[PDB]
Curated annotation (Swiss-Prot):
Record note on quaternary structure: Binds to the N-terminus of actin.
Functional summary from the UniProt entry: Acts as the pointed end capping protein which maintains the length and dynamics of the actin filament. Blocks the elongation and depolymerization of the actin filaments at the pointed end.
Protein name: Tropomodulin
UniProt similarity note: Belongs to the tropomodulin family.
Residues of the full protein shown: 222 to 388 of 392
Domain of life: Eukaryota
Intracellular or extracellular location(s): Cytoplasm, Cytoskeleton
Organism name: Caenorhabditis elegans
Length: 167
C-alpha cells in the first residue's frame, strides 16, 4: 500500500478510495500513521480501514476517536494485534455510537489481552446500544458481557436481514 498516496487522496476526499489497508506495515513512521488517520477524517467515502499488526500504541491510535465519531461511511475498522490498551479500546467502541456507520470492529490479540471488569462493562453497554455492529472482535471474560454482546449482535443481524427482505 502507498501510505503517502492514501494520505493525499483521503485529505482530498477521494470518491474512489474506499479501502485503506496497511496491515503488517510496521516500517511506517508513527507520524505518518498519525497523519493517515487524520487524513481519513476528511473522507466521506472510506469504507474499510485496517491497521492490523502495525505495532501501533495508544499514542498513534488516539486519532481514531475523531475518525470514528466523524465518519458516516466507515464500515470496517481493524486494529487487532497491536499495543492498544483496554481503556482506549473501550473509548473507540463507545465512539461508534455517534454515527454508527461501523458494522465490523476488530481489535483482538493486543499485547495487553486482559480488559478488566470496568472495560468489559463499558463495552457491553456501548455495544448493546449500537444498532449497526454485526461483528466485534473482542474476547470477553465476563459471562454477562459475552451474553449481552452476542444478543445485541444477533439482534442487529436480524435488523439487517429484515430490512433486506423489505421488513
Amino acid at each position: 500500500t502507498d501510505v503517502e498516496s492514501c494520505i493525499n487522496r483521503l485529505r482530498e476526499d477521494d470518491t474512489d478510495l474506499k479501502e485503506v489497508n496497511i496491515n503488517n506495515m510496521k516500517r511506517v513512521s508513527k507520524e505518518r500513521i498519525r497523519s493517515l488517520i487524520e487524513a481519513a477524517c476528511n473522507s466521506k467515502h472510506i469504507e474499510k480501514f485496517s491497521l492490523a499488526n502495525t505495532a501501533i500504541s495508544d499514542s498513534e491510535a488516539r486519532g481514531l476517536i475523531e475518525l470514528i465519531e466523524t465518519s458516516p461511511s466507515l464500515r470496517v475498522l481493524n486494529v487487532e494485534s497491536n499495543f492498544l490498551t483496554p481503556e482506549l479500546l473501550a473509548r473507540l467502541l463507545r465512539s461508534t455510537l455517534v454515527t454508527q456507520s461501523i458494522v465490523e470492529f476488530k481489535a483482538d490479540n493486543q499485547r495487553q489481552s486482559v480488559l478488566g471488569n470496568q472495560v468489559e462493562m463499558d463495552m457491553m453497554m456501548a455495544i448493546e446500544e449500537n444498532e449497526s455492529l454485526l461483528r466485534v472482535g473482542i474476547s470477553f471474560a465476563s459471562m454477562e458481557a459475552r451474553h449481552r454482546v452476542s444478543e445485541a449482535l444477533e439482534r442487529n443481524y436480524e435488523r439487517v436481514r429484515l430490512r433486506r427482505l423489505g421488513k
